[model samples]
Target: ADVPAGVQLADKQTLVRNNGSEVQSLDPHKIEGVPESNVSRDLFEGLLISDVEGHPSPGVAEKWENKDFKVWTFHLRENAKWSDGTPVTAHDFVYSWQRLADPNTASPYASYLQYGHIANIDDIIAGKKPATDLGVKALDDHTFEVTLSEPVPYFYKLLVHPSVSPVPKSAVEKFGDKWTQPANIVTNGAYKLKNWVVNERIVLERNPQYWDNAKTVINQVTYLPISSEVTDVNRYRSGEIDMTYNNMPIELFQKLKKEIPNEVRVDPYLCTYYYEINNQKAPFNDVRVRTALKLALDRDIIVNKVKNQGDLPAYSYTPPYTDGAKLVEPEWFKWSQQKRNEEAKKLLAEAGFTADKPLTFDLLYNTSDLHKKLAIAVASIWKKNLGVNVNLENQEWKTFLDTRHQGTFDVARAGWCADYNEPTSFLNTMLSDSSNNTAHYKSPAFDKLIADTLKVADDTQRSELYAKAEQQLDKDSAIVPVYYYVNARLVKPWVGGYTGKDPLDNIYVKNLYIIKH
Candidate 1:
C-alpha cells in the first residue's frame, strides 16, 4: 500500500527514519557519497562510531591500544553479532578492508582508507600487491592488529567512517555480484534491513541481535526521497514528512524562520561553492580567460542577491571552521572593485578581446532558482566588467552531474563538501591524480605536495604543507571558489535528539531519538 512509482533497486534492506525514502543496498564497504554514508552508518557497524558529540566511540571494537606509534590493536566486543547470528570478529574487518582495497573492486574510497597511516594499503589498491600483504591482520578470533607507515592522530576517527566498516565474508562469497542485494545483506549494527522499494520508500527495523540494542531506541525507520525544495518544505509543513535535506528554497526558509524559528536551524557547512572552467576546453583553456571570469565576479553581490541569508561568500576551497585551521583568503580578495575591473579588462585585452570583440562562452548551472540567479548575476558581472557575454544553460541535478563528470561543460558551477573534518579531504579528493579528480586538473608539484603531506607525521607540518598546496592551486587558477556554504534546515519542534552537526550536511540517523508524548 505504501509503494511509490519506481523500480526497486535492492531488496531486504534496512529502512530507518521511515519518512518514505528508498535504499539501494546496505553494504558499507562500497558506499561513497553522502547519501550512502548517511544510511549505511545506521545499518552497519564499523570498528568505531561517533558519539552524540561527534567524537570517536567504540562500536564493534570494545577497546583498542597502540603498542607503539606504528602498531595498533583492536579488541572486538564479545557480544557483537551479525543479524544471522554470526559473531562479529577481527576477520570481518580484515575481509572488509581486503575487499575494498582489491584492485578488481575499484572502490573510489580505497585511497581514503589507505591514505595516510595504513601501510601498503595504497600499494595494494594500486595493484602493486595483494590486500592480504597489506598491514592489517587478524591476530585472533576477536583481536586485530595493523601496522602503520606513520603515526596518524586521526586514525581512530577514520575508523568510524563508513568506508572502513566490516562486511560478512559469507555474504560476499555466496552472493558474488548480488552481495549487497537486500536478501543477501547481513547486519552488525543498530538496524537491520527489512525491505526496500526504490524511488518509493525503504523500511528498516531495529536489530534485536545488535550489540548496542539497549541504546538504539528507534525501533522502525523509513525515508522518502523528495528532491524538490518546495515540495519538501510543503510536505514537512503539512506533516507529511518529518525532515527534508538539500535544496530548500530561500523564501520558505525565511517564512519558517520567522514563524517557527526553533524548527529552522542554520549552521555553516564545510562546503565551498565554486565554478570550474574546463581547462581542456577552448577559451577557458587560457589562464587569462579564466582569470578574467574570476576577476569579473562579485561574490558578495551573489551571496546577498541570490542566497539572501545563511550563505557565506566562499573565497577559497577550505572553510574557516575546519578544525583549528586558519582561513587563507583567496587572491581575488586583495583587489579593490576598480582594481578587479581593471584586472578583468587587462586579462580580456590579453585574451585578444575588446569592447567590440566580445568573448562568448556558455555558463552551466544546476536547475535551481538560486543557481539560476547566481549564474545570471555572474553573467551580468562579466558583461559589465570584461565585455564578455555568457549564454546561461540550466540542467537538472543529475544531468548537471553527468555533464560535469564527463567534462563536457565549458564553465560549470559545482561545490564540494568535506567528507571528514580535514582540509586535505577537500584538496586531495578534487585535485589529486586519483579517480575522483573530476576536473582533470593536474600538476606534478601539486601531486607531490599531496603525497608528501600524507606521510608527514607532525600535524603542524601537514597543515603548512596543505596551506602551501592550496596557495599553489589558487596560483594555478585550477578552480574559482566563490563562497563557503552554510546549511539551513527547518526542524520541527516535535523532533528531538537530532543534533545537526554534520560538516557535509549529512544527517546520520543512528544517534537520533524522538521524545515520546
Candidate 2:
C-alpha cells in the first residue's frame, strides 16, 4: 500500500470490520462517557501503556522510579513526538491530569483517581492548593514526578489510561473554546483523527511522527457507529464490516458459533455486571427489602435466557479469570438455597412484609432487547420466589446512565470492567468512597479496610484485607452481583494477529493484520 506523507506503517496492515458501534467522540480529556472512552483508547497514547500480556510497559515514558514511596519520577521517551512534529512531553501529562481532575471539568471518571494514592487531588480541586501542588508535576522537559498519599502498586498501570494521556497545551490555547472539537485536536498517539461525523462514522489516519510508528501496522481505520444487533449482523454478512463485538444478539451468536466455530471467539472479561438498590430510597433503605430482592433473583435463569451461551453467572465482583489470579469465593456460597430463602423471609418478616403484604420496587435497565429480557426475567423471579412486585423500566443508554449517576432510580443495573489487570481496579473504582458508589453506599470501616490494605507491604495480607472488604460489601448487599462477563466476537477469516488483551474490549488496531494470500 502506498503511504502518504502523514501516514506510516509496519510490516503488515489489517482492515477492521465492526457491525454496529457507537463512539460519541475521541477527545481523551473529555472521554467521560463509555462510548467516548471506547474510541479514544485507539487514537490516544498515555504515559504508560499495556502490552499484549496485560502488563504495564512504557509508552511515552521509558522508565520510572519511586523515591521514598511518596515521590515518583518518570523519564519520557526522546523519540516520542505528536503527529504535527511537536514532541510529547511530561508537561502534556501534567496538563491533562489537572484538566480532568478540575471540578469545573466535571469528568465523571475523575473521582476514581482521588482520595487514595492521590489524596491531595480532591483538596486541590477544591481550591486548597495550586494545581501545580497536586500530586503530578513536570520535573523537567522529559521527566515527570508525582507525590502520592500512600504507596500504590498499580499506579503504573493506571497511567496507561486515556484519563492520563497528555494533551497539547498550544492546541487547546489556539482553539480557545473549540479545543476538543475536530479541527483543533492534536495527536500524540499512533493515529490522528481524520474525520468524526457523529452518528455516522469516524476516520483515523496513521501519524507519521508517532514514536512507535515503525510497529503500528494499520495506516487508516474507520469506526462506524451502529447500535442495532440485527443491522450490524446484516452489514457483516454483506461484507460491509469486518468485526462484530459483544453487542451481537444471542440467537445470532449461536448460529455463527455452530456454523463457523473458529471465527467465533469468547474470552473471559474482568467485569462484573450487577444491580444496585438505592439505599437512600424508602423501601430500599430497609435491609429486608434489599435482602428479599437479592434472594429472589434466579441468576441461572437470567443468564441462560438473557446472556445465553458465552456469558456466565456472576457471584463475585472479581471475574473468575483475571490474569491468572484465582477468585476467592465468598463464604455465603456455602449456604443452602433453602437456608438462604428462609433467612431472607425472616429478614423480610422483621421489616413488616408478609405473604399478604409484598415489597414493591422499580427496576431500571438500558433499552436493549437483551437488557429488557433480563429486567423482565428478574422482575418475574422476584414475583415468583419472594412475592415481591417489581416494575420493569427501560431507558436509552444515555438516559439510563444519567439517571443512575444522578441517583434518580430505585434499582439500577451497572458494571465495571477492570481498567487494568488488578483487583484494586475493580474494587477501588466501584466500592471505594471515591467511586461511582452512586448508591450512596458508605462505611468508615470499609474505607479503613481499603486504606489499611494499601498500607500493607505484604501481598498476602493485602489480599486478605481485600477479601474482608469484599465480604463486608456482600453482607451489606450494597450491590447485587449477577455475573461476570465473557466477550464473544465473530471475526472474518482474513483477520490475523488480533490479540484480545483489552479488559474493556477496547480494540487495538496497531497489533492486528490482514492475512494476505
Candidate 3:
C-alpha cells in the first residue's frame, strides 16, 4: 500500500522540517552546504555529536579524552552497532579520516587535511606519505586514537562537525556512490534511511540498533525539499509541516513572530551574508574603489528597512560570536550617510571616475526574493550617491557556485556559516592558500599572521594575531560584509527539544519529542 505522508505524522511522532533549496548531496565527507549537513548528521554518527541544546554530546564513542592536550583517544561504547547488526569498531573512524585525506578522493574539503594539526596528516594528503601513515589509529577494536602536531583549543567542537563522521568501509566498497541510497546505507546514528525520493522528500525511520535508542524518542522524520520559500512558509502555516528552517519569508517573519510567538523561532546565528568582488577585474582591482563602493552604501537602511529581519549590518567578515572582537565594526565601518557618500565620491574621483566616465558594474546573486530586494537597494544607493549604474543578474544555486568560482561576475552574493565555532572558520577563508578563498585575495602579511596564529597555543596571543590578520583583511577590502544572519525558523511549542542553539543552528530531531499530555 502506498503510504500517505501525514499518516505517520499523526500525534507528532514524526517531525517534519524544510530541507532548503536543492539538497546537493548527502555524502558526509564531501558535503559542504546546510541541507546536506542537516540530513547527514541524522544518518551517521561521529565520535561526538551536538545535542538538541547544541552542546557537545556523546556519539558512537561513549567518551573521549585529550592526552597531553595534543592526542585524542576515544573509547567506543560496546552497545554501538551498525544498522546491519555489524559491530562498529575503532577502525571505522580510522578508515574514514584516511579516505578524507586521500588525494584520490578529490574531496573539495581535502585542504583541511593540509593543516598539520593531525600528526602526519599534511604529508599523507600531499601524497608524500600513504593514508596508512595518517595520525589516527585503532589501538583495539573498541579504542581509537589520534595525535596532533599541536594542541587545538576547539578540538572537541571540530569532532562533532560533519566531516569527522564515520562511514562503513564494507558498504562503501560494495556499493560505491550508491552507498548513500536507503538500500545500501548502514547508518549508526539515531535514524536510518528508510526511503529517499529525489527532489521531493527523504523519509527516515528510527534506528532500533542505535546505541542510545532508548531515549531518542522520535520514531520518524520527514525532510521536505521545498525550493520555494513562499511555499514552505505556507505549508508550515497550513499545518503540513512541524518546523521549517532557513526557508521562511523574512519580510513577514517579524509579523509572524508577533502573530504566533511560540511558532516563530528566532535566534542569533554565527553566519555572515556578504557580497564578493572579482578582485582580478578593473575598478574593483583597486582597493580604493572597493572601499569606496562599500562606504557609499547605507547598511543601516539595508537592515532596518530593506531586510526587516534581525540581521546586524556586517562591518567585518568575522561575526561577533567569535573570540575577542574588539574591532568588529572598525573605523571605516559606517558613518553618517552624507559623510560616507562624500568620502566615497572623493575616493572614486581619486581613482579617476567622472560624470563622463561613470563607474558601472554587474552585480550577481542566486535567486532569492530578499537578495533581489537587497540588490535593488544597493543599485539605487550607488546611483543616487556615486552616480553609478548597476546591472543585476541572478542564477540558480549550483550555477552561481560554479560561475563565482570561475570569477564570472563583477560582484556576487556570498554567505558563510561556521563550519566550526571559531574565528578561524571565517579568517581561514581569506588565507592565500585556502581553497575557500574564492575572492582570490592575496596578502602576505595577512597570510603570515594567520600562519603564526595556528602555531601559537596561547589563546590570548592567538586572538591578538587573528585580530591583526583581520585588520589587514579590512584594509585590503577583499570583500564587503553585508550583514550577520539571524536564523528564522518556525518550530511548534509542542516540540520539546527543538533547540538549534549553536552558531550554525544544527538540529538533531532525535532529541525531540511531543509534549502532549
Candidate 4:
C-alpha cells in the first residue's frame, strides 16, 4: 500500500504511530489491551504469526506439523538472535511458556495458557501439578514440541498471542520485573527497543541482527501514547506522526476519506465497545438495577447520533461474523424502543429506587473525545428515563485501567478484541476466575459451559454449547454490549506493506517501509 497523490508524505526513515493508549506492561506474560499487543509484535516473537487475514505464517518456528492432532513438533530458525546476542533456541520458548503457565508467576495473561488445548495446563493452573508438568518441551536446540490434551482447531491461532511469545531467560533473571525496561530488555524481532519515556513516547530501531532484517525497510519507528482524539488528528495533520492506527475519531475519520482520500483508511477487526458496572458495589449489586441501566440505553442514538462511527448495535458480546455470535441475541433487543424505556422504569422501581433516594454513580471513561461523548449520552439517558444521576469522570488510559482493576469505579468503559476469531474469545473473559474479568462476574453455570464447550470435538455441537453459555452470561447482565467496532485511521500512501483489517490490526512494523520520498 502506497500513498496516493495530493497527500504530504512523512519522513522516509521514520514511522510514527499513535499507539492510542499507553501500554500496561511490556512483559509478555502480563500485558493486556491493544496498545500492548503492538509492543508484543515488535519486541518479541511467537512461534507463528497471523497474516493480515489471520492466516498463520512462520515466525520463530520456521515450520511445524502434527501427526495426530495431539502432539505437535516445531522446527526453529537458527539464525535469529536476541538483542543481547544469545541465539534464540527452543529452550527460550519452553522457558517462557513455563513461566507464563506457572501460577506463582502471577502473569495476568497466564489464564490464556489453558485455552483448553495445552496438555496438563488444567492440572497446573489448579495446583494439582507444577509448571514443569506442562506439555511443551525443548526437543533439542532448534526443536520444540507441544502436546495438547485435545485437538484444538484454533491451536495455530494461539501461537499468535503474546502470552506464547519467547523470553530470554538470562535477561529476565538479571533484570527481574524490570527486564522490559528499554535499557534491560532483550528482544528477538525485527525492531529493537531504542527508548521508552513513561507517558511520553517510545522509539524502535531496525535490528540488523534479525534474521528477516533485510526484508524490512523502515529505519526507525516511534510510538506516541496519544490518548486524545483531537491531539491524534492534529499530530497526523501537522506531520508530527507518519501513521496512526485504530485511534482516529469517527466523524473526522470519515471526513478525511473525502477531504484527503490519499491518507484516510477504514478497515475491519473483531471488536466490541461496552460498559462494565462494578457488580461488587451497591446498587449494581442487584441484577434488577443492572438490567434497568442497559434497557435505558438508546443504542441507536449512541451509535448514530452521539459518536457517528460505523458501529453496529451489538446484541451479543461476539461480533456478527463469528460462529456462535448468531446463536442467541440479547432478549432486550427485541422490544420496541418505547417498550424498553417503559420496562426500564419498572425494573428500577423494583430495585427500590426513587427520586428522593435516587440512584447515582460515577461514569468513568478513559480519555478519548469519542468515549466522553458516549459516556455523556448514556448518562443523559439514565437521568431522563430512570431518575438517576451520573457523575462523569475522565482519567488517562493507564489510570483508568487501574481503577477498573481495583473496582474503584461505579461504571467504566470497556471493550474487547478477538484474541482469536471465535465466540470463545468474547465469552471466556467473564469466566468465574479469569483475571481479565473486569466485570467481576461469576456464574457457575456460565463457567461450566465455557469450560465444556472448548472440549467438544464437533464444531456444530460446540457452537450450540457456546450459544447456551453466552445466553446464560447475558442473563446475568455481566456487562452491557453497546456496539461492534469498525476501525479507521490515516497512513501516508508512501507507507507500504501494511494491510490493516480484521486480522493483524496490531501493527507489524517489520514489513512497513517508505515507498515514496
Candidate 5:
C-alpha cells in the first residue's frame, strides 16, 4: 500500500515502459490488446480498478453497491475531473456504455456489455433494440444506475476492463475518431496524452486536473511500441527504459534473474497462449481435421523446451486459477505424446488426408523473437508427427490482428489475458456473436451452458456450467490451448510500486514513483 522501504524520490519523475507492440487503437471502446489498454489506462480511469492482487478497488466511482446483483448503483467522486477541468459526471458513463453497445459503433468489444449481463444488452447488440435502450441511466449528476438481466458475481471485476471505461462525451462527439489525438483528447485519469507517433512512442504527462493528482508521483510516462523482445532488453539494459515488456528473451530470463534478482520479475499471469483455427475454412471446417491438429500439439515441448519460462502446459482455454471454474481437460490430455500422435494421424487420414497428400496451411504469428521460435517449433512438430506441411508467416502486430480479424489466416497465434478473474473472461470470447470470435465457432449447446451460468446463484453451480461449456468447446476442437502464461520482465531497481502481482497485470502509473538511484 505504501512505497517499498528505503525508496527515495528521484529528481526526474519520468518512466519509459517497453510496450511490446504498436497499439491498435486508443479509443476506449475500440482497443483490444494489452498494449492499447496500457496506454488507455493512463488516459482514462474506469469505474473500478484492479488492486495489486487483482481485486476491484475504487476508481472513478468512489463507492458502489448492488441489489441482489441485479441492479447496481455507483456514487461518483465529487472531485473527479477531466483533463479540461470539467467534473466527471455519471452521464459520461451512460453515454459511453450506450456507445459501446451500439452496433453502429463497430467496437470489437461491444459484447463486453453482455459479459456484465447488462439488461437488454443482448437485444441491443443484436440490433433488436436501440443503444439508448441500454439498461443504464444517470440518476443524477453524480449517481449512476445499472440494471442487469441476471446476477453477475464478477460484475465489479468486469468494470476494471478498459473496454468498459467512461469516455468524454463532448470530446467524442466533437472530434469523432480523431478525439484520441493528443491535442484533442480529454482524459480523466492520472495522465493526459502528450504525444503519440504511430508505431514509435506514446508519451503521457501528469494530469494536474485529476482528482487524485496530488497522490501521483510519476510525472511523465512514455510507451515505446518496440516489437522485438531482444531490442527491449537491450534498451532496458542501456537505461533507455525503466521496465521491459512482459516478455523478455526466454533464453536470457534465468541468466538475468540470477544476476539481478530484484530487477527481474516473473509471476504467474492469468493468460492462455493458443492457436486459433479458422473454423469456417476448408480442412479446418471438418471436426476430424480440427481434432487431429489439436491432438498433435506437443504442448510440453513448447512450454518447457521452447519457452523455458515458468509457464505451465495448458490443455484448457481458461487458466487453472480462474475463480469458480474447474478446468475441462480432454481425455486425451492424459495420454502419452506417442499415443496422441497415432490418433491424430488416424483422424487426419479419415478426414481425407494421407501422408503422401498431407494437409497444409499457414501458421501466422506476430513479429517477435519469442513468437517466431514458438511458431517454428509448432510447425516442426506438426510436420514431423502428422506428416502435414506448414507454411510459417510472420507479420507485425497490427497487420497480424487485422488478418486474424478478417478470418484470412489458417491457424493464427493468439493469447488472451483475463479481463476479469472469471472463466467467462476467456470463454465469452468464443460466443457465436462475439466480435472477438476469430475461430468462427458457433454451438447452441455451448451458448446455452454459458447463458445458464448467469442466473445461477451458487458459485459451485456456476462453475459446473463453465466446466460443461469448456468440455463442449474441447469436443468441438476449434482451438488449441498450448500453455498457461507466466509473465517475465525486468523492472529497474529505481522504480517503486511496480508490483506485478495482479494476474491481469493492470498496472497503474498513479501508484508508481521514481526512486533515486
Candidate 6:
C-alpha cells in the first residue's frame, strides 16, 4: 500500500524513505543507479556488507581469508537460506559471477568484475573464453574461492557492491527475465519484496529465513521514488515520510536545518558531479577545447552560489573521501578567475573560435530542477567568461542515460558515486573499455596506472599510482570536475540508528528501527 498522506508514522516499526527516483531495475547484474541499489541491497545479500561506519562486515559468508590478496576463500554460513528455503551456497555465487561475466548477459557493469582482475573474466567478457572459464569456483557447498590476476588490497571493499551479489540460478532459468518479479523472486537478504507498485512504492518485509533475521530491525520498509526535491521536503515535513532522499531542496536546506536541527543531516558523499565532454566529437576531441571549457567556469560560484548545500568545489576526478588517495589539484586550479578566463579565451581563439564564430554546442542534462538550474548557471557563466553559446537540453532519466551513453551530446551533466571506497572506484570509469566511460577518454598512461594498482599490494604505492593517474587525467581534461557531493537530508528524530557515515551514502534499512516520538 502507498504510504498515507500526512499521516503520523512514528509508532509503526516501518520505514518509508524517499528513493529519489523510479528505479530502473532490480536485477543486481543489470542495475546501475542508487535508487535501484537501495532496493537491491535489501533484497539480495552479497558476500560482504558495509557496516554503519562503512567498514566491511560478513554477510552470507561467515568468515573469509585472502592469501596475499590474490586468492580469496569465503566460508558461507550453513544456516543461510534463500527466501524460497533453499540454502545460500557457494555454487550460487559461482553461477552469479559467471552470469555477470558472460557477454551474452549484456550487463552494463560487466567491467566491474573485469576491473577487479578476476582471472580470465576479461577474456570471458570479450568472448575469447566461456563463462565457465571464469576463476570463481565452489570448492564445497558452503565454500567459495576466487582467483585474481594479481593482488588487490581493496578486493574485500569491492565485494560489498551489489553487482557481485549472488542470484538464484533456478529462478532465473525458470522465469527468464521475469526472475526479479515480486511473485517469482528468491532473495537472501534481511528483507524480501512484498509489493511493487511501479513508480508509486516498493514495499519489503523482513525475511524470516535470513541467516541473521533475529537481529534485523524495521520489519517493513517502503521506498517511495519521489522525483522532486521540493516534494520530498514537503512530504517529509508533513509526516507522510520519515526520510528524504540524499538531496534536499537547496533553497530550504538552511531553513530546515535551523527549524529542525536534529532532523537535518549533511555529510560528505563519495560522489563527484561533473560535465562529460564527448571526446569522440569534433571540437571536444581537442584537449585545448576541453581544457578551455574546464577552465572558463568558476566552480566557486556553482557550488557556493548556485548549490549552497555544503558541497566542496572539485578540481580532481577522485574525491578526497576515498581511502588511500589524495586530491590531484592541477596547476590551473590555483589560478585566479580572471587569469583562468583569459587562458580559456586564448585557447578558444587558438582553436579558431572567434566572436563571429563562437563555440556553440548543446549541453544535455536529466530532467531535474536542480540539474536544469545548474545547466542554466553554467551556460550563463560560459557566455559571460568565454562568449560560448550553450544550447540547453533536458530529457527524462532513461532517455538521458541512453543519450549520454551513446555520446549524443557535446557536453552532458554527469555524476559518479563510488562502487567501493578505493580510488579505482572513480578512476576506473575513465578506462577506454570501461562501461562507465561517458567521456570516451582513452589515455594509455591513465589506463596503465589503474591496471598497476592491482599488482601493487602496498597501500602507499597504490596511492602514488592513483595520484599519477589523476594528474594525467587533469592534463587531458577528460571531464570538468565541478563539486564533491554532500548528502543533505531530513530524518525524523524517531528514526533510530540513522547514521549517515557511509561515504557512499548507502542506507541499509535493516540497521534502522522506529522509536516512539
- Winning model by TM-score: 5
Worst 10 residues of 3 by lDDT: 1-10
Over 194-311, each residue of candidate 4 has an lDDT whose tens digit, in order, gives 9999888889998877888777667888898988877888888898877875756754766787789878766776888888988888879899888888888888888887777577
TM-score for each prediction?
0.87, 0.90, 0.91, 0.94, 0.98, 0.96
Whole-model alpha-carbon lDDT for candidate 1: 0.71
Q: On lDDT, who's better, 4 or 5?
A: 5
Better of 1 and 6 by TM-score: 6
Query: Which runs in model 5 stand beyond 4 Å of their true positions?
Result: 4-6
Model 3, span 342-396: residue lDDT tens: 9989999999998788998999987766677788988998899988888999987
lDDT of 5 at 250: 59
Residue pairs in collision within model 6: none
Question: Residue-wise lDDT of candidate 6 within 418-438, one digit each (tens)?
Answer: 989888999998998887787
Q: State the lDDT of candidate 2 residue by residue for 1-517, as single tens digits.
A: 2233443334445464552445433556554554566566566788777765557778888998986666778999988887679888888888877876777666666665563377578676566765566688788889988888888766776777777777777987787557656677787777888877766777777878888787777777777766666666667778777776456565577787788788777776777788877877787777677776676576777777666765777666767566424456765455665666677777888888868877776789866555666777778777777777878887766666668778798998776777767676666654444535667677677777777866887878877777777776667777788878876677777665555656656555665555553
Descending-lDDT candidate ranking: 5, 6, 4, 3, 1, 2
**Model 1 bad stretches (over 4 Å):** 1-26, 67-69, 280-283, 353-373, 376-380, 387-405, 454-457, 501-506
lDDT of 2: 0.70
- State the RMSD for candidate 1: 6.0
Better of 1 and 2 by TM-score: 2
lDDT value, candidate 4, whole model: 0.80
By TM-score, the better pick of 3 and 6 is 6
Clashing pairs in 5: none
Clashes of each: 20, 5, 0, 3, 0, 0
TM for candidate 1 is 0.87
Superposed model 4: Cα runs more than 4 Å off: 1-11, 126-128
